[PDB]
Amino acid sequence: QDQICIGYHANNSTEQVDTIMEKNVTVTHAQDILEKTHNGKLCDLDGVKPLILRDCSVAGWLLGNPMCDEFINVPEWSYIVEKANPTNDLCYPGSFNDYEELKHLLSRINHFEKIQIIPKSSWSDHEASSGVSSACPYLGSPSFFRNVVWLIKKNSTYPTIKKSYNNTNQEDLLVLWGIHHPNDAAEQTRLYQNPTTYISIGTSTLNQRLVPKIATRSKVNGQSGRMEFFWTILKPNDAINFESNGNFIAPEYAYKIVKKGDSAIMKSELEYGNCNTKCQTPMGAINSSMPFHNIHPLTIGECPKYVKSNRLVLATGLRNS
Amino acid sequence: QDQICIGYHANNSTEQVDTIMEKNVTVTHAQDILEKTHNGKLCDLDGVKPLILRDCSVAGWLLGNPMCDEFINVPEWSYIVEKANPTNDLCYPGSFNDYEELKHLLSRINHFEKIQIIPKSSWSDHEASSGVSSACPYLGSPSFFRNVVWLIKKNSTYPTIKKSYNNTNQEDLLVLWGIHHPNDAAEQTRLYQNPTTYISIGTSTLNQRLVPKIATRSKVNGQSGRMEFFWTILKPNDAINFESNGNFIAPEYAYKIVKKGDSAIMKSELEYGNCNTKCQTPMGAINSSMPFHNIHPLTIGECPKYVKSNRLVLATGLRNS
Amino acid sequence: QDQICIGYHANNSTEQVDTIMEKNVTVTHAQDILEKTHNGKLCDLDGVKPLILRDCSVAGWLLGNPMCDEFINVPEWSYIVEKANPTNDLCYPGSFNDYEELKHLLSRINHFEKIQIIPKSSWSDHEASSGVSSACPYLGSPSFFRNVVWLIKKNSTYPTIKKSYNNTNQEDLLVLWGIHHPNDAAEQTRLYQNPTTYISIGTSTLNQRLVPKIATRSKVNGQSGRMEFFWTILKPNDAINFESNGNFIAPEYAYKIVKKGDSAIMKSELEYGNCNTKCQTPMGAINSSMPFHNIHPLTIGECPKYVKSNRLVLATGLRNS
Amino acid sequence: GLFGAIAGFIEGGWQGMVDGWYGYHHSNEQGSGYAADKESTQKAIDGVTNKVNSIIDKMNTQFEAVGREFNNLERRIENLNKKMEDGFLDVWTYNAELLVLMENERTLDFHDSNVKNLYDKVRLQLRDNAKELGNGCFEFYHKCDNECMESIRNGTYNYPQYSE
Amino acid sequence: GLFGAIAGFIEGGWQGMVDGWYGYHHSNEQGSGYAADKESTQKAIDGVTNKVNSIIDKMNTQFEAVGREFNNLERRIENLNKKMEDGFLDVWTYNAELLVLMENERTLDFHDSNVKNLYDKVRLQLRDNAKELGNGCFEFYHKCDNECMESIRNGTYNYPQYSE
Amino acid sequence: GLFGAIAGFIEGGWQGMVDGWYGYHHSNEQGSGYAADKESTQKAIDGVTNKVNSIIDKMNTQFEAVGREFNNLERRIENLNKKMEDGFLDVWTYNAELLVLMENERTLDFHDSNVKNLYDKVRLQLRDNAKELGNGCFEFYHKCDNECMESIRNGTYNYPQYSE
Ligand SMILES: *[C@@H]1O[C@H](CO)[C@@H](O)[C@H](O)[C@H]1NC(C)=O
Ligand SMILES: *[C@@H]1O[C@H](CO)[C@@H](O)[C@H](O)[C@H]1NC(C)=O
Ligand SMILES: *[C@@H]1O[C@H](CO)[C@@H](O)[C@H](O)[C@H]1NC(C)=O
Question: Disulfide connectivity (chains A, B, C) (predicted)?
């Protein structure tokens, strides 16, 4: 006696999915949609290599910490990698004004071009090769941040400086300078004859006046004195004006901003793998077609969408047995 | 042979909806729940007209930029509309302290009443009608912000000012003042005989001391000098105290805050349409009963809930064919 | 004739649930998952009592407002409860630098140990028991904040102070100090012979210089003068250095931070109930196994997840009738 | 469909029926016609209406962006403000789109369900006295005048009437 | 309901049945009674229990508001703080309310489904040997003692027993 | 399952069928075999494929955390930044996990549904000419060669062929 039956596919797949009422339901076909793997390397992003600061900070790099010569002339980068706690930062102790806002600026920058705006040789009436310290040693010898100059008195006189620089380039200019806060009055006269000093700085936008703070403080890297650093962005065709009768850490090299674009400052201890990728995290790169991942929130490049899941499997086929 | 059938409605509607498994499913009845239209006009909100700054900024308005006379006596507003980049702002260059926080204050204010707190005529020992500049021209003639007074020396003397003002009104008082930062010492003595000057300001809450910064700077609107403006809110029954021996841009007109309430500062290039509405966006008004809209996030009034969708159609009836 | 029927449970439960298409559907079994009750008391959290400031603020407590003696030696706390508007705050008017950031610090602290770092008796060349005011009365008598000392001139002379304190303890040290801003020059010489004064303060991290502002201001609690207070965290083995020739409100008692951990600053008007709980809100404690609650967002302890619902009932059984 | 009725065993819908969502077509010696089943139609109306109002009422407290201004040295917090408001915008957009898709499908399978249960209502009644053609239609073995038809529509069909 | 059983072809529920969610009432020469169907009842229990625990476990990491204080010149960031915490509060409230509505409806149609499938289980077994009354009841054409009833409850009904 | 077919009246699935998700096994004088039902299989494929692509496309604009740095006196806003990004992370994680659970269950009941409707398709056709065994199988009362079998598979079965 003839017969006809209605039935459904079954196979030997052991792929399980979860539903709202039942966990670990075996199915015939399933699509996993969560990437859970990385290469453990820091890679170029689309052929353009990252900037891997080593044991230097952004400040040590920008100001030119003698220990950071690896980064004197840095090419175009995709993103910036900094370690959690860089060892080479402010060799001469002190502070950096609006450091975090500047780091934020670097997120939108992919290339600097270093240019000498006020040559160390142009100082006729001050000494310009004696602003060195054992707090910033280079090869066992007293030195200083390379992009600025610690000017000191010449022949027991520190004439007031009036210096101006007109940004003639077509790019925005990152300009850095500093003030020295000495530990005592004797030090003040010894370095800059004048007891009572100031540094004024003015642009079309900037109007500031610095006075050094002479005071006794605990020693960091052997110094009771402090260096305080400042920065600004000179617009194309705006000039920057400095006037000072002491304690002036003058700019010499500034940074043309020749490439704006997406970038990021990554915190990672990893170093440079010789590879290339489309998506980079602080713990490794991702090559996936997957829509989701669970590796790291802080991503850069053409990346899946981060999610805090350990498993995301979508049922496509039907119930097995 | 008699028969009975079970069936369902079908019509000639072509309204489609989308489901999770199928796109563009034709149905008999459907409700669209997304408003996608506006009038392209800036309208009164419930009968109360907005404040439409033209080519003036909030600063040009409040300080009384000569080019902003349209807004010398402004009536009650619902919301404030400012252009993306207003041309009339600080005619004499300089800055405005906590500008953004003040703009934030205006979000909660719907009406000012301008009052003269220190008359231009009450200055006996200083000149009060000579603080004008070609940076702030009125009808081709040197002028100045109208709500403050650039006091200058009289008969080669600038006696120290001690002025106090007690807020006797029952409303909070917005009070503005400024300091002049000159470009050189000669200018300092020329304007205010005294070389070394200050402005102190004190309330029950405020305790500040200003010193002008004499320095050379690049020219904005022909001036190397700067004007720096400050503000405070005088409480009912608190007094404000000024003391100064130079560089003092004194208040003359302050602003009673006679109406607190919801308001907003809108960025829009549009101008005043002679209309009325319940919901306003920077690109036009919305008259809808709809729950959702896709026009603009920044809404004011009794408005639908913004959403980034291009289409939101809910099925109510059943599948057509 | 024998028969068999298929049927389902029904009972006399009146518990209703809501669905997307129908409201108030009666069911046989249901689970409510929203806690809606509290005890109306402020309780210990797991046996460790909160710190209940009464009519004192954090500032009045830390600086030692004479009216806040209840909190001279405070034991370990779980969380801190402050009233909306405490009456005892800065008895002598003035301000507290970075007050909000410090309150934020207290969120991560559960125990202070007060220590005398510079004894009131160690001042040989200045007066140390004459810095009292009727603005800070104790038992109807002029007094002052107990943790700092308002030093005044001795024998018509105020020699410059150089004082240093090395944090020898293994814990971080919260250190407070202040400056006096007088209302006039006569007051300045009367209190501190020297007309032109400063206070410099320096650590490995801190480098600040204060100058008092002599000015006329409206009276708060009878004083036109102001006290301005500052704080810092001295690291283990770092020293703090003070130098001053006037207007120095010196530290005497500082606070060892002996317990870091989770804590919170609660705004509540309630007082101490003699109870214990696992979860505390500003309006009462919660003893529930429930996953959700609707009492207060600002929770501390092992708590359900706050939600703005008035009712959350999940159907488990089936439709009644 | 999930329940097999709409575009299932019933081929297509009736252009003819205009007073309801589901119903009957009858044919007898007194003639032919369409009638709408009020109970299932009305209950369906309540269902979908309440669905619309629930969907609407659950999104009455969404997230309104207000405007904040930041200066040239407040770029971090400006970026935070922007990113947060975009964030909320995105969760709410997602929620709306998703809810619409889901409840649209639920609505369709709800109507399909209503049709099948109506069909089962007549089927369970006529048991032996008619034959299932297979397409939503029942061919009677007895004569079924208008009163008998209505007795089937309101649910009171008196089965005690032979049919062989 | 979606599957037509609860408040459908079965008029109402049984106040009498107390040991289960779904089951049988039998009537024979040995007497009458109710029995609960353990398999479908238990499976239903597991279903809903796991639903409750899933709903609960998916919301164990929601959003806890902490307190931040701002001064008179930090009104922009204060407003940002407030707006953000309200935002999260609102997405989570929406999520909870929505999830509850949806899964309540799923639960109800789940029980309805279980009832209909139980009914189909008996129906498919008795085929010819009983008649469908139309209301969830089967009238036997043969005598069905307690052992036969139980054989229908556990699924082993031996159809080889004529009935005309 | 919700519709009673998969792991319901049909005991288990067919390891034998490899060209489709649902189908037929036939047995006659010309022999036996499996065939896949293309229409329901294909429609099912479209359904689930589009579900996957919808789920994916609705989450293409989620929330990307960027890095912000704060100093030792910006702890309030630092905490705000962290709490907000955690917040978004949590709403999106919840959404993903939830969506997956829900649509997995919908997928399973969708396949179950397809199976039952296929079974009903054959049942409605064979009416009298075969008997329902109760397990998804129909025993013919007439001879059904391959052409007749195919006529049942494509839906054109010519019922006019007696069977007593
Ligand atoms: C810089 O130079 C340009 C011409 O090369 C001049 O127009 C401009 O005024 C200068 N910038 C300043 C602010 O001095
Ligand atoms: C302002 O005037 C009122 C009396 O009209 C007085 O009580 C108050 O003290 C004055 N304000 C100040 C701070 O001088
Ligand atoms: C504090 O004392 C320790 C030794 O007890 C010393 O090493 C350290 O340098 C001192 N701190 C400072 C900064 O003076």
Answer: 43-275, 56-68, 91-136, 279-303
